[PDB]
Symmetry: C3
Subunit: 235 residues, 3 copies
């Protein structure tokens, strides 16, 4: 069963601020379940657009309709894929869960564009919930999905606003966090001062990605992540 | 079965600040479950007192003792009724849930009074839990919920008061109404603080907003329960 | 079954700031479940170190594997024991749950020390969970990861706030007294004790009023025997 939801939020600020905030959105007080975020790949493609894949870990609980052994708190992984076009001031993002996909797959697409008439950045989100099994509890799944969607809409807008206002996070592998911080800082400067302006972090990136990959080898999620990295969600 | 709880909090500030904060208390980082707040009716009565009814939506979970089909995350609607007397610096407020009432009804009365002698505003709260073999469990649940609510109320109000004193908005349940709501609320807030509370005294903004909300409410399952509740006289 | 976890966090600030923040860490937006914190005992010992025992109450839920009547939201009590050596810029802390210990006991030790090479305060934490093995493991790992995050975010929040809304007593009738005591203590702690200038504050009147109130409330609480028992223990 497939359930679709959609939302629009308008940020009263420039595209550059919104996109930077996206890359720095966690941690914030409105997203308590997020535990870590790592950058898996990043490059500027030949067309001049930034392509990034990130991996998030969160705590959470499966719905009450699942088998009892699967109930309770656990950690889940999310892939996040994005493209930024600095010349057109556009961004597209996609997320999906990497685990529990037979029970529930939740995919979210968001596009960001600038409304010059109102000097604001428009974020249009579409979410697809794909539920595996029970039709007998259709209404319940529906209710659940709506509730999840509504919570996510709020968390997204509050968290982004928080970060935007602040501008004016851990690796899943603690031994990589310091390296991540060093890379992220380098990237943030380059992103704001060079890339978005149409105008450098190789050592920091190398150290960090080597650390993350060594950690990922030992993680059960790696095959699922590799598989998802094969997908082309924007195609 | 009826369980009663009471609490008092003293805000070390003036009535105007506390009352304004009440109308703008959400969102705040201490109340993650609140999803929207709408103004259903508002007027100054012939005695000069402000009468307001609002409608809140929250996410939440029913207690573990309910039927398995009812367990899990859901959304609930809350009615909020208030009277403000600016001459006497008093406010009274009442909330109750509109749905799930067969399982649990939770009613809260709060009075706010300015004590000029101690330069403080006293908030006295009373909560009545009316529950439809597991008495001790219901008691524990009610105590815990109450203690959580006391904390969230004082922390959230303090957060908002501090923001207003040193001088990110709430959603409508109907996203197509949120922008209209923001415009109405802005107008009201200015009138409330600068004119009403000072004894010196938004129709277009109100009209557009309320027309939007009512059109959305027609389509909501909660409308009959809301109408019923609006007939009640909690004070 | 015993499950062990460990973590390290480095705060880019001085020992005094980190230690003060520890005693004022709640409330903060990253720890929604904490409902109250009370000081049960405090003294400067003959060696010049601050010995404190505190009692925290939090809301929470037992794991899904417990009997159905025990499921659902509840309140739980935590003991927190600490020692501060201002001369050496060291602090050690210990927490454990006082109730439900037959189901799950969670003990955490944290040490704070100053790394002069990096001008930072190092916090080393070790957690022991004493308890469907895989499910318990998943639960413990998840709880640990959540707690590591809440601790670092909450501490950073409070440190930043003081560099640039108070906690409740479990007994509401004692909160005002607690605030008066805590304020006095805080001022002394930062201005005198951490600077090696005093082993005795002027907070005795505030302490007396507050502790008398708390103890009167504690007599009526089911947790008192468990608290007394835990206070007999010597975690360090």
């Amino acid at each position: 069963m497939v359930l679709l939801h959609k939302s629009t939020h308008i940020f009263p600020t420039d595209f550059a601020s919104v996109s930077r905030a996206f890359f720095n959105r966690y941690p914030n007080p409105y997203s308590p379940h997020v535990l870590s975020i790592d950058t898996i790949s990043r490059n500027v493609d030949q067309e001049g657009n930034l392509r990034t894949t990130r991996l998030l870990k969160k705590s959470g609980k499966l719905p009450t309709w699942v088998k009892p052994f699967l109930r309770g708190i656990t950690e889940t992984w999310i892939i996040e894929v994005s493209v930024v076009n600095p010349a057109n001031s556009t961004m597209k993002t996609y997320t999906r869960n990497l685990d529990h996909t037979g029970i529930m797959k939740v995919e979210e697409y968001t596009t960001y564009q600038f409304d010059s008439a109102t000097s604001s950045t428009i974020a249009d989100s579409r979410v697809k919930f794909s539920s595996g099994f029970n039709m007998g509890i259709k209404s319940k799944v529906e209710d659940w999905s709506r509730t999840k969607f509504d919570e996510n809409v709020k968390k997204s807008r509050m968290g982004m606003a928080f970060v935007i206002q602040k501008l004016e996070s851990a690796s899943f592998a603690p031994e990589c966090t310091d390296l991540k911080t060093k890379y992220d800082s380098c990237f943030n400067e380059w992103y704001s001062e060079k890339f978005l302006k149409g105008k450098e972090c190789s050592k920091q990136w190398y150290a960090y990605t080597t650390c993350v990959n060594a950690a990922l080898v030992k993680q059960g999620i790696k095959p699922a992540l590799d598989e998802a990295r094969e997908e082309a969600p924007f195609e």
